[PDB]
Amino acid sequence: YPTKETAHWKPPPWNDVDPPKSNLTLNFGPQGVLRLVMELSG
Amino acid sequence: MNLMITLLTNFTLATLLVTIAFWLPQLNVYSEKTSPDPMGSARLPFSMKFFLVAITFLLFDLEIALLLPLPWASQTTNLNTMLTMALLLIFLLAVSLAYEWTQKGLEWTE
Amino acid sequence: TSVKPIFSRDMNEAKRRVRELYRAWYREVPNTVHLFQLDISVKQGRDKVREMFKKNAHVTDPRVVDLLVIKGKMELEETINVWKQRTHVMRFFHETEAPRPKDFLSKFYVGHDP
Amino acid sequence: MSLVYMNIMMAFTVSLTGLLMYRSHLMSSLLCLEGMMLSLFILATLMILNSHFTLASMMPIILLVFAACEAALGLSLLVMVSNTYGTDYVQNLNLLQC
Amino acid sequence: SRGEYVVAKLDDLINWARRSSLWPMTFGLACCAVEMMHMAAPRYDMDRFGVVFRASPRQSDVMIVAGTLTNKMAPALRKVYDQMPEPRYVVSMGSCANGGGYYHYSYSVVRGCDRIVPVDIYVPGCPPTAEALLYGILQLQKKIKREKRLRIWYRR
Amino acid sequence: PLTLEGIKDRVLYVLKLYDKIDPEKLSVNSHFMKDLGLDSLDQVEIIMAMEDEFGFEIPDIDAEKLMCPQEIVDYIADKKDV
Numbered sequence: 154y155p156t157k158e159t160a161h162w163k164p165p166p167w168n169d170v171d172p173p174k175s176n177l178t179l180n181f182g183p184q185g186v187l188r189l190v191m192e193l194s195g
Numbered sequence: 196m197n198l199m200i201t202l203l204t205n206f207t208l209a210t211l212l213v214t215i216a217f218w219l220p221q222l223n224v225y226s227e228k229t230s231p232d233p234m235g236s237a238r239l240p241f242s243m244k245f246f247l248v249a250i251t252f253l254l255f256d257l258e259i260a261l262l263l264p265l266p267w268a269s270q271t272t273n274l275n276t277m278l279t280m281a282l283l284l285i286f287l288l289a290v291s292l293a294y295e296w297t298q299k300g301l302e303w304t305e
Numbered sequence: 306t307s308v309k310p311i312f313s314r315d316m317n318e319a320k321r322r323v324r325e326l327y328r329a330w331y332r333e334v335p336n337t338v339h340l341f342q343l344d345i346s347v348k349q350g351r352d353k354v355r356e357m358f359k360k361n362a363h364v365t366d367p368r369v370v371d372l373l374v375i376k377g378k379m380e381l382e383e384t385i386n387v388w389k390q391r392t393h394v395m396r397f398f399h400e401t402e403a404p405r406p407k408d409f410l411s412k413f414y415v416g417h418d419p
Numbered sequence: 420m421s422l423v424y425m426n427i428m429m430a431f432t433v434s435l436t437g438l439l440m441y442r443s444h445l446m447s448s449l450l451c452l453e454g455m456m457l458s459l460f461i462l463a464t465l466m467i468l469n470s471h472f473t474l475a476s477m478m479p480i481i482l483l484v485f486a487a488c489e490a491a492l493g494l495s496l497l498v499m500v501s502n503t504y505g506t507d508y509v510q511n512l513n514l515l516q517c
Numbered sequence: 518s519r520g521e522y523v524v525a526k527l528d529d530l531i532n533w534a535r536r537s538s539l540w541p542m543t544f545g546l547a548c549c550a551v552e553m554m555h556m557a558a559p560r561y562d563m564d565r566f567g568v569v570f571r572a573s574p575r576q577s578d579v580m581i582v583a584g585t586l587t588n589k590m591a592p593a594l595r596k597v598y599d600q601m602p603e604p605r606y607v608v609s610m611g612s613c614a615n616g617g618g619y620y621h622y623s624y625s626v627v628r629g630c631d632r633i634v635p636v637d638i639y640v641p642g643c644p645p646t647a648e649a650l651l652y653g654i655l656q657l658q659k660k661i662k663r664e665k666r667l668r669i670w671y672r673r
Numbered sequence: 674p675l676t677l678e679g680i681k682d683r684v685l686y687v688l689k690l691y692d693k694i695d696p697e698k699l700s701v702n703s704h705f706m707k708d709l710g711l712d713s714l715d716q717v718e719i720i721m722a723m724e725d726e727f728g729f730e731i732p733d734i735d736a737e738k739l740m741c742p743q744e745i746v747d748y749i750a751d752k753k754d755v
């Protein structure tokens with residue numbers, strides 16, 4: 154029985170799975186000398 | 196009472212040295228600084244592995260909490276039961292360690 | 306007169322690449338003013354983008370404007386990735402430079418240059 | 420009864436009403452739950468020491484250990500919610516309204 | 518007066534403590550880094566003067582610019598100098614830090630680190646020897662010894 | 674996206690937020706290049722304002738043929754139902 158309150162409720166997924174909706178970037182700068190841009194995954 | 200005096204003296208000396216370290220160079224009038232990190236502005240990435248080693252610490256620390264009355268427990272007159280349950284608690288800590296091992300829970304912080 | 310192209314066969318594909326590059330710079334400018342915490346406005350940075358595009362608007366060679374789009378994408382890639390500092394972004398705005406004499410008379414007054 | 424028991428019960432009810440009135444964070448709910456557990460530890464401990472009931476002295480340690488294990492489980496649930504939405508906000512846990 | 522004597526003794530105390538515990542942040546830019554490492558090596562041993570080996574930049578007292586400052590690293594030098602707490606000092610080691618040096622007429626080289634940071638000691642050489650750099654650090658200590666902070670404060 | 678009239682009203686609202694177009698001469702059939710006298714990049718930032726308001730990516734091969742607000746509202750009417 155949809156009312157005005159329950160007028161935006163969509164049904165759940167058929168497999169009950171909702172979509173989940175990155176990795177670290179470190180700039181080891183000059184602070185010899187060298188700059189490094191790391192893309193780390195942990 | 197002597198312990199409360201000692202804790203208060205240690206806390207008072209620590210707070211005194213912290214106040215001195217935070218307000219002795221404030222008397223200097225050096226300059227006002229403007230000054231406009233490896234990560235640029237990125238959000239702190241969660242790592243599951245640090246949380247796993249922290250929970251593994253907590254669980255083995257609860258097993259340690261069970262193990263702590265053993266020097267008093269050895270004084271009992273039910274020594275066969277005491278020895279069986281002592282070896283059983285250390286064995287269950289070992290089995291928790293082995294299950295954490297063999298299911299790759301101790302990996303990349305091994 | 307028959308030369309090897311770079312990306313564009315003629316000026317239409319070339320102007321398309323120029324147009325996509327202007328779109329990408331226009332989208333990037335507010336993020337640049339935010340994360341570098343520049344002291345300019347988004348209108349002012351977009352006017353500098355428009356100035357840098359309209360400076361090269363007299364070019365009629367497809368290979369030259371291909372290389373201009375290549376170098377503009379290199380500038381944008383060095384700006385999105387934080388490879389420039391604030392200094393490299395603000396070198397487009399010649400702020401510490403005194404205004405040059407533009408007419409004949411003040412160039413006569415200050416020195417020998419034409 | 421004893422005057423300290425009033426304060427330990429009142430602390431349990433304060434941590435109860437904190438646990439029964441969320442603001443945003445699931446971690447604040449877990450902290451209120453562990454404040455409840457701490458007050459239970461203190462109250463059980465003061466009774467068992469007060470009564471000289473010797474064999475129940477192992478009781479609060481057990482009351483610690485299990486519940487701290489429970490706390491560990493709760494932290495893992497928070498992390499899984501934090502691995503879904505980025506935060507631990509309880510208003511992100513509303514998919515089961517429909 | 519009495520206050521003049523007290524600020525004289527206190528300036529002597531704080532200048533003794535600052536010069537006798539100098540902590541360097543060394544920019545290992547170019548060949549002068551090797552000779553700084555020889556000034557830290559066991560023949561010369563900066564640490565016997567209280568000059569520690571590789572303090573972190575947020576707690577260092579002097580910034581030793583040892584090598585060529587290129588244009589691509591001039592804001593990095595300026596940023597590290599801005600992050601140093603006061604009293605900070607800057608020693609310019611060798612000819613490229615001093616005036617550009619062998620790369621003075623280059624398109625890519627800052628002609629002396631004094632265009633970017635204020636410089637207290639200029640140590641000349643290509644590279645200046647580790648004994649010459651240690652001489653420059655002792656001259657910096659003598660410059661700190663004759664500072665008159667509290668005396669000028671008492672006269673202002 | 675609902676009614677074509679609201680889409681035309683919102684196109685005109687976007688183009689009167691645009692500060693180089695004089696709102697007096699601005700009509701729905703007004704040409705950007707020869708009537709209002711705009712640069713190509715002015716039309717490009719117009720189309721990106723349309724992308725900001727209408728919320729979909731307009732490609733380049735069909736944004737170059739949007740030379741009046743009527744062409745813009747017809748293009749958005751093509752990319753949706755109405």
Ligand code: SF4
Nearest residue numbers: 548549611612613644
């Ligand atoms: S002053 Fe000369 S020797 Fe020294 S670092 Fe520079 S190039 Fe090398």
